[PDB]
From a paper:
The enzyme, pyranose dehydrogenase (PDH), from the filamentous fungus [name] (CcPDH) of the Basidiomycete division, is composed of a catalytic PQQ-dependent domain classified as a member of the novel auxiliary activity family 12 (AA12), an AA8 cytochrome b domain, and a family 1 carbohydrate-binding module (CBM1), as defined by the Carbohydrate-Active Enzymes (CAZy) database. In the catalytic cycle of CcPDH, electrons are transferred from the reduced PQQ in the AA12 domain to heme b in the AA8 domain, which acts as a built-in mediator and transfers electrons to a heterogeneous electron acceptor. Therefore, CcPDH is thought to be involved in the extracellular oxidative degradation of the plant cell wall. Here, we present the crystal structures of the AA12 domain in its apo- and holo-forms and the AA8 domain of this enzyme.
The AA8 domain of CcPDH was determined at a 1.8-Å resolution, and the final model was refined to R and Rfree values of 15.7% and 20.4%, respectively. One disulfide bond (Cys138-Cys141) that is conserved in the AA8 domain of CDHs from various filamentous fungi was observed. The main-chain coordinates of the AA8 domain of CcPDH closely resemble those of the AA8 domain of PcCDH, whereas the amino acid residues surrounding the heme are different. On the other hand, Tyr108 in CcPDH is conserved in CDHs and forms a hydrogen bond with the d-propionate side chain of the heme b. Interestingly, Glu162 in PcCDH corresponds to Arg181 in CcPDH, which interacts with the propionate group of the heme, which results in a local positive charge at the heme binding pocket of the AA8 domain.
Numbering used by the authors: 21 to 215
The structure:
């Protein structure tokens, strides 16, 4: 399970899943219903060892038929891509999601971070069908421990199969916050990673 986690780099709090084998983290912030009504978006965080190749998720758990987001750092430059697989095969580029890389992204030489806004990312056809407003969500996580996408300058780069991947359940309502807009602004305005 993920827990509420203070991001010391930015002062914001995420619902964070820390994976012990990879030493990577997957953080999410979702908008509320009390304030900031339209919830067709969330903020994500991919964080891991600076030497890792790429870090990704599945928004419906299964690799199959759910938005797959994949982030990496090309030198010092963060990248992010939305993808879609109909089986256990190299995913294709998925249009639908609107992705914005936010501040505190890049590398300090110890960690890499990709902090992102994902709009139009909570409803889709197939798989889980979307991220529920309330109740349980199952997310996937995926990680390549060593090797960057083949052409790391291109957000549509081909990539090698993850060295590690699995799934976990979490309470979506616990990841929702009326602080969402404040958090979004704060993260957008954070400078890039440098240490
Ligand atoms: C060359 C590309 C890829 C291939 C051939 C591939 C293949 C597979 C295979 C065979 C599994 C079954 C479990 C395992 O053996 O690890 C799996 C699981 C998974 N993959 Fe991929 N994968 C690829 C890329 C991706 C990407 C880019 C993501 C998302 C960023 C992703 C997300 C997952 C997740 C979450 C699981 C675990 C849940 C499930 O079993 O469906 N994969 N993948
Ligand atoms: C949002 O995503 C869906 C795919 O899940 C797509 O059909 C639609 O065109 C996208 N909408 C916008 C407004 O970009």
């Amino acid at each position: 399970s993920p827990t509420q986690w203070y991001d010391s780099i930015t002062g914001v709090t995420f619902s964070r899943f820390y994976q012990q084998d990879t030493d990577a983290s997957w953080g999410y912030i979702f908008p509320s219903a009390s304030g900031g009504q339209a919830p067709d978006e969330f903020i994500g965080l991919f964080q891991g060892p600076a030497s890792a190749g790429w870090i990704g998720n599945s928004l419906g758990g299964s690799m199959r038929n759910n938005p797959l987001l994949v982030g990496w750092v090309d030198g010092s430059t963060p990248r992010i891509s939305a993808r879609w697989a109909t089986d256990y095969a190299p995913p294709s580029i998925y249009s639908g999601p609107r992705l914005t890389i936010l501040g505190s992204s890049g590398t300090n030489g110890n960690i890499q971070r990709i902090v992102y806004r994902c709009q139009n990312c909570t409803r889709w056809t197939g798989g889980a069908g979307g991220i529920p407003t309330t109740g349980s969500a199952v997310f996937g996580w995926a990680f390549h421990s060593t090797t960057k996408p083949l052409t790391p300058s291109d957000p549509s780069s081909g990539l090698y199969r993850h060295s590690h991947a699995a799934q976990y359940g979490f309470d979506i309502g616990n990841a929702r916050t009326t602080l969402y807009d404040y958090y979004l602004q704060q993260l957008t305005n954070a400078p890039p990673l440098s240490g």
